[PDB]
Amino acid sequence: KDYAKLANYDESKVPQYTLPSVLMCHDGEMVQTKEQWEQKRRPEILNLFTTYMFGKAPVLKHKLPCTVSRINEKALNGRATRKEITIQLTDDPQGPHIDLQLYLPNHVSGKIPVFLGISFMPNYTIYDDPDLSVPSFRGSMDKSWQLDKILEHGYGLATFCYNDVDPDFDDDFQNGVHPYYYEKGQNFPDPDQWGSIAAWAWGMSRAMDYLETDKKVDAKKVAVIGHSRLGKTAVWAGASDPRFALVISGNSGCCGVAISRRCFGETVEAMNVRFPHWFCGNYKQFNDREKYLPFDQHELVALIAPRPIYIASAEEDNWSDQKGEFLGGKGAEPVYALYGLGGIGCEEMPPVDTPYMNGPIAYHNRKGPHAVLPYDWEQFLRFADKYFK
Amino acid sequence: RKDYAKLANYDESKVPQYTLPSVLMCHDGEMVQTKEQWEQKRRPEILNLFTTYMFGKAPVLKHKLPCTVSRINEKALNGRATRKEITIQLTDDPQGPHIDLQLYLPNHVSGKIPVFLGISFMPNYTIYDDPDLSVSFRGSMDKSWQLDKILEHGYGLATFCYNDVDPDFDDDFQNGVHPYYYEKGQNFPDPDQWGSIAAWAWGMSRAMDYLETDKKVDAKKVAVIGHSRLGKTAVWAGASDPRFALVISGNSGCCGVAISRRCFGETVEAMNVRFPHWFCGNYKQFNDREKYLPFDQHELVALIAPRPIYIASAEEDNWSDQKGEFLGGKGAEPVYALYGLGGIGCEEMPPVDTPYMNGPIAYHNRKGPHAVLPYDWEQFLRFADKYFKN
Ligand SMILES: O=C(O)[C@H]1O[C@H](O)[C@H](O)[C@@H](O)[C@@H]1O
Ligand SMILES: O=C(O)[C@H]1O[C@H](O)[C@H](O)[C@@H](O)[C@@H]1O
Ligand SMILES: [Cl-]
Ligand SMILES: [Cl-]
Ligand SMILES: [Cl-]
Ligand SMILES: [Cl-]
Ligand SMILES: [Cl-]
Ligand SMILES: [Cl-]
Ligand SMILES: [Cl-]
C-alpha cells in the first residue's frame, strides 16, 4: 500500500479535531498549579506515552559499565579534547555497546555544556578529524553537526550511531538490545514494551550516565538533539529523562511534535506500517484512529516543561506537517504558564526564516529541504546561549 | 469500507504456517503440569491478557444492581410455564438502561431448575409465540430458541436483548451503559476498557446476579448461550464469570473460538474495521498482525476448563472458519487433561451432521446456513443432560 498517494497537503482539507485537554486529569480535576501538574497530571501523561506509544524500557538499579577507550587532549590541532567511551547496554561485556564520541573545547573556563546528538551514521562522519579513518566517508555529515560552531560557543558535542543500540530494520527485535531483556518464554516485546525509538532514547540515557561522571562536562546543561526519526527519539529522551536541560526537535514531524489529529502528510498508519519496529505494539491500535488517541503530541512537549525545547521545521518537508509541529509547541503553553513562563510569542504559524525563541518554546520554519543545516545550528546555539551562559 | 468477504481466503491449502502460543507456558517460562499451577498462576495470566488486549475490563460492582419482578404469570403457555419479567437497573440512573429479562420456568417440576441464559438479537416477544405478549413479530425467532424442547427437558430459559446493555452500532460509546462508567475527565473507554462484547457479557453476569436469588432456579446449573457475535459474548461471559456451569458457542467464529492465525474467512482486521465498537481499543493493534497476538482462541476455550463447552459450526458458514472453530476446542484439551478429562474424541474435524459430545468439549458442524436451528438445540440439550441430570 502506497501512503504517499494518500497524503493530504491541503490545509483547507485538515479535519475538525479537539486536542485532549493537557490540564484535565483522568478523574476530572483541573490542574491550576505546578504542584498539581508535577504530583498528579504529568505522571498520568508520562504513563500514557510509555504504555501506548514508545513502550516501557528496562529500569536499571545501577549504572552499566563505561570505559574511556582513547583520549586526545590535542584533537583538531589543539582546539578540542576528543574522548571515545564504550558504554555497555547489558551486564554482558561481549553484548551490544555504544561507541560514544565526545568533543570538548580546550581553554574555556567552567564545566562545558554538551549537545548529546544521536546520529544516522558512524562517529567518523561527524567531522574530518584526521585521527579517525573509515573502513559514508570521514566528515560526510559535518554540515548537519557544525562542530566548529559548537566549539566557538564554548559547548561540547557527544554523538553515537543509533545502529549501536538497535539496527533500524524490522527483524522482530532478534538483533540489538531487545533480546537481552526478554524473560524466559519471551521471543518478543510485550505490547507495552519498547520499540526501536524507546531503545535509541534509552541509549541517550546510558550516554548521559557517562556524561554526568565527566569532570569537564556540566551535567546540568546537557541538551538532546536529533533529526527526523532521531528527532522523535530526542524529544522522548527529553520527556522520559528529565536530566536533559534542553531539547532540540529537528523536523521530528509525525509521532514527534506534529499534532497527529491533523492527519496532514505522514499519518500514524503510514508510520506504523512502513516502520513496524519504531513504536510499541500497542501504538498500532491508533492506525486511522487518531480521534481515539488518549493524548496528542502537544502533551509530549508538555512533558519537557519547564525545560526549554526548540522545534525546527523545513519549508519543503510537507510530509512532516510543519504547521502541526508549531501547533504541538502551541498546545504545551498552558503547562509552561504554570511555571510563570510565556509561550512561543505568536498566535499563527510565523513566515519562513522567522525564528521565535524569546520564550521557553522556540520555533522556526526555514527555507529548503528536510535536513539539519548551518542555519538551524545558528538558531539552536543562540537559543542554548540564553540558558547556558 | 473494503468488502472483506471478497478478499478473504477460504482455500484450506493457502492457510499460512503458524505456531499456537503455548497455553501451558507461563510468561516467565514455567510449564504447567498440575491443575494447581493452572488455577494459581497460568489461568490468571491468560485471563488478564484477554481482558487487557481483546475484550476490555468491565466495571466491578461492590453490590448487586437494583432489579424488580415487573410481571409474573404462573399460568403461562396454558399452565405449562411460569413467565417472569425482571427489570435490572444497569446504572445509578433509574431512567437509564435496564436489562428486561424474560424467564420461562416449566411448571410441574419439583427441584431447583437448570436455566439456559441466552442473549438475543431481538426483543423478548420474538423468543416464543406466547399469546400474552404483543409486538419483527411474536415468536419470529422460535426456531433459534426451541423453548418447547427446553421445557420438555425440565429446564427453563432466561433471555434479554443485547441492545438493552449497549446498542450494536458505532456511536463512539456515547449511548448504552458505557458513558455511565466514565470518570469526570473521560469521554471514551481507555484502550484496556470494555467495548460492546464485554458490556453484553457483563450484562449476562447482571442477569446471573438476579437468577441466583430466584428460589426456583438452580444457580449451580446455568448455561450461557449465544449465536455469532452473541456466541463470542457467551464464550467471554463463561470465561470471565466462573459461576456459569456450561457454555454454548453458536457459530462464534472469528475472535470467538476459531484460531486467528489460520487467517481463514473473517480476520482480526475485517472484524475491527467493520465493528470498531465490539472489542477494546488495544485489540486494534492486531489488525493484519495475528502472528503478534500474545494468545490465540484455544486459550479462551481453556478459560472454561474444567466446565463443559459445546462448539457448534454450520457447513455453509465459511466466514466463521469451521475447522478453526474445531481447532480452538482441540487446542484447549491440554488444560482439560490437567483435570483428568477427555478431549473432543476425534483428532481431525468430523464430517457434517456428526456430533461428538462424550468429552467436556463438544463439537458438531451441521448442514445448512449460519443460524441456530432445532438440530443444534437437540445436540445442546443432550449434552446439558449429561451434566444437569444423571
Ligand atoms: O527519519 C526520517 O528521515 C523520516 O523517515 C521517513 O520519512 C518517516 O516517514 C519520517 O517519519 C521520518 O521522520
Ligand atoms: O453476529 C454475526 O452474525 C456475525 O456478523 C458478522 O458476520 C461478523 O463479521 C461475524 O463475526 C459475526 O459472528
Ligand atoms: Cl478529535
Ligand atoms: Cl522493558
Ligand atoms: Cl553490553
Ligand atoms: Cl510490536
Ligand atoms: Cl436471537
Ligand atoms: Cl416471547
Ligand atoms: Cl471426560
Side-chain angles (χ1 to χ4, degrees), chain A residues 1-381 383-389, chain B residues 2-5 7-35 37-74 76-142 144-151 153-183 185-390:
Chain A
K1 182 162 165 195
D2 178 47
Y3 285 97
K5 80 184 187 153
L6 291 181
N8 173 47
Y9 299 119
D10 180 352
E11 183 58 31
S12 61
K13 292 309 196 320
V14 168
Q16 168 60 359
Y17 64 90
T18 310
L19 259 31
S21 181
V22 65
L23 296 191
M24 183 174 64
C25 301
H26 197 261
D27 72 11
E29 170 167 14
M30 294 295 307
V31 176
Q32 14 204 138
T33 67
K34 72 174 164 207
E35 288 74 27
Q36 284 148 9
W37 176 250
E38 292 185 15
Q39 289 171 259
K40 203 179 166 174
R41 187 50 180 151
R42 188 183 191 282
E44 286 175 17
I45 292 177
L46 182 69
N47 183 239
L48 290 173
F49 275 107
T50 306
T51 301
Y52 291 105
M53 185 157 178
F54 296 97
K56 296 192 228 297
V59 289
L60 297 160
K61 272 78 102 63
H62 76 285
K63 289 183 174 194
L64 287 166
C66 317
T67 13
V68 182
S69 52
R70 170 158 82 178
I71 308 179
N72 177 352
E73 298 215 54
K74 282 155 134 49
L76 277 48
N77 210 203
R79 276 188 306 147
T81 299
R82 192 193 60 254
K83 315 199 186 181
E84 279 82 13
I85 308 90
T86 305
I87 308 187
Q88 298 307 279
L89 302 171
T90 74
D91 264 325
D92 162 12
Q94 281 214 314
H97 53 98
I98 283 170
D99 299 313
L100 187 70
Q101 179 181 81
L102 166 66
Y103 289 98
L104 297 165
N106 285 328
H107 309 116
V108 314
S109 30
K111 285 176 140 271
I112 313 278
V114 162
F115 290 81
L116 178 61
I118 185 164
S119 81
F120 285 99
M121 305 268 270
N123 286 331
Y124 63 67
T125 69
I126 303 308
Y127 202 85
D128 200 15
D129 175 355
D131 316 354
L132 311 167
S133 58
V134 35
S136 184
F137 60 82
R138 202 178 64 202
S140 63
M141 293 296 285
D142 177 76
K143 201 175 227 309
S144 46
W145 292 105
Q146 297 298 310
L147 183 52
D148 296 325
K149 285 190 214 248
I150 297 168
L151 295 182
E152 274 187 31
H153 270 258
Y155 302 148
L157 174 65
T159 55
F160 69 94
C161 189
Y162 75 137
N163 290 309
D164 298 350
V165 181
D166 181 35
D168 191 357
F169 65 91
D170 179 33
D171 69 295
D172 287 341
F173 290 116
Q174 287 150 8
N175 313 147
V177 71
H178 278 78
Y180 289 86
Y181 295 83
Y182 290 161
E183 296 198 348
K184 288 324 191 286
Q186 179 176 25
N187 314 316
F188 204 62
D190 300 332
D192 61 347
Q193 282 181 328
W194 57 349
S196 290
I197 291 192
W200 302 331
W202 187 85
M204 298 182 96
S205 294
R206 305 295 64 71
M208 184 58 171
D209 285 359
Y210 169 72
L211 288 178
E212 70 180 5
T213 86
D214 192 294
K215 155 100 178 180
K216 325 193 78 191
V217 164
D218 191 347
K220 297 308 155 167
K221 294 180 182 147
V222 178
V224 286
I225 184 172
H227 178 241
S228 205
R229 69 196 65 177
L230 295 185
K232 311 172 210 290
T233 300
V235 172
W236 181 237
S240 64
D241 194 343
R243 291 186 291 174
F244 300 119
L246 186 137
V247 167
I248 314 243
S249 161
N251 304 329
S252 67
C254 184
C255 306
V257 297
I259 301 302
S260 290
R261 276 158 177 82
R262 281 170 53 76
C263 300
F264 186 107
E266 194 170 21
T267 57
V268 166
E269 183 182 313
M271 169 76 66
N272 282 321
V273 167
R274 282 157 50 260
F275 302 104
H277 58 300
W278 280 10
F279 295 96
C280 68
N282 274 335
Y283 195 51
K284 283 118 184 100
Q285 78 188 267
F286 303 112
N287 293 359
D288 210 29
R289 290 185 67 256
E290 290 92 341
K291 252 355 92 188
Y292 303 101
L293 285 162
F295 46 73
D296 214 312
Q297 298 311 106
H298 70 300
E299 288 169 298
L300 182 55
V301 178
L303 290 183
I304 308 315
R307 292 167 297 146
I309 174 173
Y310 205 127
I311 304 171
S313 303
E315 178 193 49
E316 302 295 86
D317 190 23
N318 296 326
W319 183 247
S320 269
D321 189 9
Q322 306 94 321
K323 172 159 179 191
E325 288 187 295
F326 168 79
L327 289 175
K330 285 303 301 189
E333 286 183 341
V335 169
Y336 283 85
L338 302 191
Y339 295 85
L341 298 165
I344 302 176
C346 58
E347 289 300 322
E348 324 280 70
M349 194 188 165
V352 57
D353 282 29
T354 311
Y356 286 68
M357 68 166 82
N358 270 287
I361 306 158
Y363 183 87
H364 75 240
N365 188 16
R366 64 141 175 75
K367 226 176 73 204
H370 181 74
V372 186
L373 296 184
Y375 176 92
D376 293 305
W377 271 111
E378 261 146 41
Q379 306 315 316
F380 303 155
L381 292 172
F383 192 57
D385 281 348
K386 294 170 195 281
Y387 296 89
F388 287 176
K389 298 315 195 168
Chain B
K2 286 192 324 202
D3 177 14
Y4 283 99
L7 302 166
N9 176 53
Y10 312 96
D11 180 6
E12 184 58 32
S13 50
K14 318 220 88 212
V15 170
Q17 295 207 129
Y18 63 91
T19 333
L20 281 185
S22 173
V23 59
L24 258 26
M25 198 202 231
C26 297
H27 192 275
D28 67 12
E30 175 179 353
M31 291 296 304
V32 171
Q33 344 275 11
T34 63
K35 101 182 74 167
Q37 288 177 288
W38 179 255
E39 291 191 6
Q40 293 304 305
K41 195 162 154 33
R42 183 53 177 157
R43 192 182 185 283
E45 287 177 47
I46 291 160
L47 180 65
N48 172 85
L49 286 177
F50 276 103
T51 307
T52 303
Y53 292 102
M54 193 155 179
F55 295 93
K57 296 184 288 181
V60 49
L61 276 312
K62 307 188 295 137
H63 293 98
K64 285 189 186 192
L65 290 168
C67 60
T68 30
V69 183
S70 324
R71 194 187 336 277
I72 305 182
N73 181 357
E74 299 190 357
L77 311 192
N78 302 317
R80 300 156 54 214
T82 292
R83 198 193 159 264
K84 307 190 181 171
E85 309 177 345
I86 303 94
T87 311
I88 304 188
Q89 186 185 312
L90 303 175
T91 77
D92 284 342
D93 188 8
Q95 327 307 337
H98 304 81
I99 279 168
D100 306 305
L101 185 65
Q102 175 186 75
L103 168 64
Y104 284 101
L105 293 173
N107 291 330
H108 321 303
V109 179
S110 283
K112 294 177 141 293
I113 293 157
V115 163
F116 289 79
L117 175 52
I119 189 185
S120 69
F121 282 95
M122 297 196 288
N124 288 340
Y125 59 78
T126 67
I127 297 318
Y128 193 80
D129 204 346
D130 188 326
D132 326 335
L133 301 173
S134 48
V135 170
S136 208
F137 65 96
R138 259 234 306 281
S140 63
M141 294 299 292
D142 168 71
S144 302
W145 291 108
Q146 295 294 293
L147 177 56
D148 289 323
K149 277 227 260 279
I150 295 179
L151 296 175
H153 280 243
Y155 305 146
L157 176 65
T159 61
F160 71 95
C161 189
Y162 77 135
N163 183 267
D164 284 12
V165 180
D166 176 24
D168 191 1
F169 82 91
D170 187 21
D171 55 58
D172 285 354
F173 294 114
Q174 300 307 300
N175 269 244
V177 290
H178 273 78
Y180 289 89
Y181 293 92
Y182 292 159
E183 300 201 335
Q186 161 175 36
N187 51 56
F188 200 76
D190 299 331
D192 62 346
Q193 288 182 323
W194 60 347
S196 295
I197 286 171
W200 293 330
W202 179 93
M204 298 188 88
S205 284
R206 306 292 67 79
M208 180 56 166
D209 284 357
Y210 165 80
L211 287 182
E212 66 180 16
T213 78
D214 187 306
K215 66 164 177 174
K216 278 303 320 204
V217 312
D218 189 344
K220 308 290 151 161
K221 298 184 166 57
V222 180
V224 284
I225 179 170
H227 177 240
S228 319
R229 70 198 65 182
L230 298 186
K232 297 183 225 286
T233 300
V235 174
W236 184 230
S240 73
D241 190 344
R243 296 184 291 174
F244 294 122
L246 163 66
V247 179
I248 296 149
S249 167
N251 308 178
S252 67
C254 175
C255 309
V257 307
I259 287 185
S260 293
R261 276 158 174 89
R262 290 168 44 77
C263 301
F264 185 102
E266 192 169 28
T267 59
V268 168
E269 181 190 323
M271 173 73 70
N272 287 327
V273 167
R274 280 149 59 250
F275 304 102
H277 58 297
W278 276 15
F279 294 99
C280 69
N282 278 333
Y283 197 54
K284 280 74 173 171
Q285 69 187 284
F286 300 115
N287 287 2
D288 200 50
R289 281 177 81 259
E290 284 92 337
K291 139 201 201 145
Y292 298 96
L293 286 162
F295 48 72
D296 216 318
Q297 299 307 290
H298 69 304
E299 284 166 300
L300 172 59
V301 174
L303 288 177
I304 315 304
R307 298 169 285 148
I309 177 168
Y310 207 126
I311 301 173
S313 304
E315 154 207 81
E316 291 170 14
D317 187 6
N318 302 302
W319 185 239
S320 288
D321 185 7
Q322 304 98 316
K323 186 182 173 193
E325 289 180 301
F326 174 78
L327 289 176
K330 285 301 304 179
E333 285 179 340
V335 178
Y336 280 89
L338 302 173
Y339 291 81
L341 291 171
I344 305 178
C346 49
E347 154 71 21
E348 54 149 344
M349 197 196 157
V352 303
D353 283 1
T354 310
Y356 285 73
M357 60 167 79
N358 293 132
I361 311 173
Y363 183 91
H364 67 239
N365 182 34
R366 71 148 168 76
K367 271 177 152 88
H370 177 84
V372 180
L373 297 187
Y375 180 85
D376 300 303
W377 270 108
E378 203 31 77
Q379 313 316 314
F380 299 153
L381 293 172
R382 186 176 193 271
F383 190 59
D385 287 7
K386 294 181 150 72
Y387 297 95
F388 294 173
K389 323 193 168 222
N390 320 282

